[PDB]
Design a protein around this ligand. Structure first.
Ligand SMILES: O=c1ccn([C@@H]2O[C@H](COP(=O)(O)OP(=O)(O)O[C@H]3O[C@H](CO)[C@@H](O)[C@H](O)[C@H]3O)[C@@H](O)[C@H]2O)c(=O)[nH]1
Ligand SMILES: O=c1ccn([C@@H]2O[C@H](COP(=O)(O)OP(=O)(O)O[C@H]3O[C@H](CO)[C@@H](O)[C@H](O)[C@H]3O)[C@@H](O)[C@H]2O)c(=O)[nH]1
Ligand SMILES: CCCCCCCCO[C@@H]1O[C@H](CO)[C@H](O)C[C@H]1O[C@@H]1O[C@@H](C)[C@@H](O)[C@@H](O)[C@@H]1O
Ligand SMILES: CCCCCCCCO[C@@H]1O[C@H](CO)[C@H](O)C[C@H]1O[C@@H]1O[C@@H](C)[C@@H](O)[C@@H](O)[C@@H]1O
Ligand SMILES: [Mn+2]
Ligand SMILES: [Mn+2]
Lengths: 278, 278
């Protein structure tokens, strides 16, 4: 939110008011948050805006036990596709610091290995609060069993975002696998819900991510004290939070896809961040 | 930007990802700002969000010389349609305080008469900076020769907005009546421009409106010192500013229409704020 200097002169195609970018999908939520699909953004304009703020993006990823095997491909493909041209700080949380692969990084990019012993929400909020506030402007929190195949850039950045789960974007809300037991803090009735957000890709400003992760951690602790575990764990709580605190952007399933499970439907022009067999 | 409490439970239609709200118009800019049309927003969700922040909206209007005649209809229709349910502070700038009509206001709404002797941008920035920062969260700056016919509410609120001029929303950029002389600070080349914004309806947070009005006032003073007056005066400068500082929402021409001049085209589902004969 600091003073924003003027954009330079730029030559690009004029947006046309009577020509939608995309007619096949919803590109704005009913609370006026953009839903990010290919064709909705001019990345040159966005890159200018975010570079003029010297934006730094933190990316958190957990690689515990056997999941350290996923780091090499995750990080090497992140170097090809994630926020290229911007300042990036990777935070790799692991129980095996020596198993973190030595990955060559582009300029302006750094990696920190954070040793650790549910945990994700606690670890993001409780332990790293002060560090993240000092070091980055935005946090992006993702699963490790993944690879980048195409551009994932500043179009995602906003105070708070979630990602449409690739298995549920066409589903009606009654079919969503929200927690349905009223005894859980994650409870959502059958007549509520905007979207089903996937636990493996959310983010926002540091402040908003710390709010989300704190709230989810607190709600998970209440459930534990009451002897209940939400059906989809942290994802159930994330869904409850984003129902009650609307995200300021929503990422389309371009941003979290499983090609082996779901193919490559017409509505996806790009597959950006995709599941690796586990 | 203060801590946002949770929304309550709400029952409303599920947004459907594979059903666009509107297929006939562009509903998001290439820099991911919503373009506000009827059908794109659920006003119940937005009202909740903004009431939970106890939002106060300031509305500035100038009524100098014969234009004091427009105040009664302007204000009486604003009471019917502008931010109803929210805190509103009208700021009426006039050379004839005694000619301001006595208009009955709903609860939580107030009106201040500010006596005055180009001026609008200066008067909004220079003279009223401290007052607005203390009194309101957002400023909305409009022409007085107008009436409200339908809802104008919190869907417009955002850090910085402009409104699509009703005569130019279908025009290509070369046809826009931007200032075209390189000697003016408002100069825009024929290969630049997103939209033609109308000078009679802009706004944003107090901070962003003070930035815009300060910059436009400064640019107008430079032009005056150089012996040039932009083709459309403050509107030319507003257009230059919004080209270089992209608005975070854009209002459709629903929000500034002239029915006598332009009728009621199919693309307009509502005529919200409309020209009165002058
Ligand atoms: O032994 C493990 C298990 C998990 N993880 C981490 O936790 C993530 C999530 O586990 P994963 O096995 O990838 O589960 P998924 O079924 O892909 O997870 C989905 O469902 C989970 C809820 O059950 C959410 O926590 C996830 O974010 C959501 O993407 C992994 O990517 C790792 O980052 C480890 O590091 N080691
Ligand atoms: O004698 C006057 C003249 C103007 N105004 C104020 O200035 C506004 C703009 O003048 P108007 O006569 O309404 O001009 P328009 O042609 O409707 O204005 C368009 O074009 C102007 C640039 O020429 C911009 O300043 C306007 O905001 C834009 O709406 C009026 O609504 C009043 O608020 C007065 O109060 N008294
Ligand atoms: C065979 C696996 C079928 C999984 C289909 C639905 O995806 C699952 O949805 C759950 C919520 O209902 C939860 O988010 C886990 C999620 O499964 C993960 O994501 C899928 C897209 C696959 O990549 C799967 O392997 C992975 O476990
Ligand atoms: C007869 C008047 C024709 C005006 C058509 C175009 O509107 C004018 O556009 C100018 C920029 O090119 C500038 O914004 C003034 C604007 O005219 C105002 O707005 C129109 C929509 C009408 O309401 C008009 O009466 C008013 O002066
Ligand atoms: Mn996973
Ligand atoms: Mn006018």
């Amino acid at each position: 939110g600091e003073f924003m200097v003027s954009l330079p002169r730029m030559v690009y195609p004029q947006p046309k008011v009577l020509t939608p970018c995309r007619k096949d999908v919803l590109v704005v939520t009913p609370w006026l948050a953009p839903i990010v699909w290919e064709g909705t953004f001019n990345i040159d304009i966005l890159n200018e805006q975010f570079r003029l703020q010297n934006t730094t993006i933190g990316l958190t990823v957990f690689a515990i036990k056997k999941y350290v095997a996923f780091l090499k491909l995750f990080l090497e493909t992140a170097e090809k596709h994630f926020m290229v041209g911007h300042r990036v700080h990777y935070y790799v949380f692991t129980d095996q610091p020596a198993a973190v692969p030595r990955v060559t990084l582009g300029t302006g990019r750094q990696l920190s290995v954070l040793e650790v012993r549910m945990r994700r929400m606690e670890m993001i909020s409780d332990f790293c609060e002060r560090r993240f506030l000092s070091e980055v402007d935005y946090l992006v929190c993702v699963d490790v069993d993944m690879e980048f195949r195409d551009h994932v850039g500043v179009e995602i950045l906003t105070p708070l975002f979630g990602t449409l789960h690739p298995s549920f974007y066409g589903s009606s809300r009654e079919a969503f696998t929200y927690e349905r037991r009223p005894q859980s803090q994650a409870y959502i009735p059958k007549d509520e819900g905007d979207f089903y957000y996937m636990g493996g890709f959310f983010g926002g400003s540091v402040q908003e991510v710390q709010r989300l992760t704190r709230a989810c951690h607190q709600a998970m602790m209440v459930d534990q004290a009451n002897g209940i575990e939400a059906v989809w764990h942290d994802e159930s709580h994330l869904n409850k939070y984003l129902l009650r605190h609307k995200p300021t952007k929503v990422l389309s399933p371009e941003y979290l896809w499983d090609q082996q499970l779901l193919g490559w439907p017409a509505v996806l022009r790009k597959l950006r961040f995709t599941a690796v067999p586990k």
